[PDB]
Design a protein around this ligand. Structure first.
Ligand SMILES: [Zn+2]
Ligand SMILES: [Zn+2]
Ligand SMILES: [Zn+2]
Ligand SMILES: [Zn+2]
Length: 392
């Protein structure tokens, strides 16, 4: 590992010693022919220059392991890129690529491929030849499908399809059993296939910003799942399948149309984070207070009228959000939440807070705007929590 040569003149003075060259954002239009003298080059950054920076001399620098061609207004990738047999990391992000050459499949040792922020409508069938690929990033493209040969990516751990045009998840993506992180955010998904059960190594599944109404029963088989992000979807019926995931740590279901907060949520015993912000929830079941490791509970923008006294059981809770609800009171048991740092209660029907709130020694912020609290009550509250930032 070498500190990068940022001065092209310095690099060309002792070319044999140049392993790392960073010419990014230097206003370079072309490369000098002399660049071919950098025979031991392993890392090359040509990002943020011009499309003409792609000198034919680059493709003869055979020791190249890492190449960054980001922000170069590239409309086409030369077929000669395939000659860089030793490439491990290739970055083509923030360009204007619509297609890729079939030669993209020649990188036998390719581990990371970044194609973020392009205009890709299709991937070549040869993408399947990248059998050592661990990360494929396609954020913000125009893909409606992936080639069936995507099933051949037997080492893939990270697949990022965030901001594309997918209407369904292909059954070939579901054959990538080594996947750990699958990002399908901001697509046009209406369903998740039953074949999701095959992704047994999946730790993170992001489906935020789609049109999902339900999940298949087979999602219960994702026993390695830690993060499940289902916010900004069309769930009206709570997907009870996800309540079988006893090792889940984070669950996001905000911006749905949920009418019921089921008692079975109490079965998510490892849950640390739960958001149900902006739904139609009326009642908080006693079973939610039975989550011993819960640190954040986000319930703002609902129709909750009361909190059960069993709230005291959430000993690890640090953040409780209940703004824009219909709360008439807080139970005195709120004072037992010793780790509470943030308590959002704006836009409710609160007139007072129990004396026991003074026990909230770690409380840093308390939000009480748009509540019918009288000036003398605001004074009393300030005195109960003198070190807390209180917004009235
Ligand atoms: Zn988008
Ligand atoms: Zn929205
Ligand atoms: Zn709203
Ligand atoms: Zn707030």
């Amino acid at each position: 590992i070498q500190k990068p040569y940022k001065n092209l003149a310095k690099a060309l003075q002792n070319p044999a010693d140049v392993r790392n060259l960073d010419l990014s954002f230097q206003g370079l239009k072309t490369l000098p022919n002399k660049i071919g003298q950098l025979k031991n080059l392993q890392k090359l950054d040509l990002g943020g220059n011009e499309p003409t920076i792609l000198s034919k001399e680059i493709w003869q620098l055979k020791d190249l392991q890492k190449l960054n061609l980001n922000n170069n207004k590239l409309t086409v990738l030369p077929k000669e890129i395939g000659q860089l047999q030793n490439l491990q990391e290739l970055s083509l992000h923030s360009n204007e690529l619509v297609n890729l050459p079939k030669e993209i499949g020649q990188f036998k040792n390719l581990q990371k491929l970044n194609l973020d922020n392009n205009k890709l409508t299709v991937l070549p069938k040869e993408i399947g030849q990248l059998q050592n690929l661990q990360e494929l990033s396609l954020l913000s493209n125009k893909l409606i499908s992936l080639p069936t040969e995507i099933e051949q990516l037997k080492s893939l751990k990270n697949l990022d399809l965030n901001h594309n045009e997918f209407t369904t998840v292909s059954k070939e993506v579901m054959l990538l059993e080594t996947l750990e992180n699958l990002d399908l955010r901001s697509n046009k998904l209406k369903t998740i296939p039953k074949e999701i059960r095959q992704l047994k190594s999946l730790k993170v599944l992001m489906l935020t910003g789609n049109q999902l109404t339900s999940l298949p029963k087979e999602i219960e088989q994702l026993q390695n799942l830690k993060t499940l992000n289902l916010g900004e979807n069309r769930f009206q019926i709570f997907p009870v399948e996800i309540l079988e995931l006893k090792n889940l740590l984070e669950l996001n279901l905000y911006y749905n149309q949920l009418v019921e907060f089921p008692k079975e949520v109490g079965q998510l015993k490892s849950l640390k984070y739960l958001s149900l912000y902006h739904n139609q929830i009326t009642t908080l079941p006693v079973e939610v207070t039975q989550l011993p490791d819960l640190q954040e509970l986000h319930l703002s923008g609902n129709k909750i009228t009361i909190l059960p006294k069993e709230i005291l059981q959430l000993k690890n809770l640090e953040w409780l959000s209940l703004s824009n609800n219909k709360l008439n009171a807080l139970p005195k048991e709120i004072g037992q939440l010793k780790k509470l740092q943030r308590l959002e209660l704006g836009n409710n029907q609160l007139t007072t807070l129990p004396k026991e709130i003074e026990q909230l020694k770690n409380l840093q912020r308390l939000e009480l705007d748009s509540n019918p609290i009288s000036p003398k009550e605001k004074e009393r509250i300030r005195k109960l929590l003198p070190k807390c930032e209180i917004d009235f």
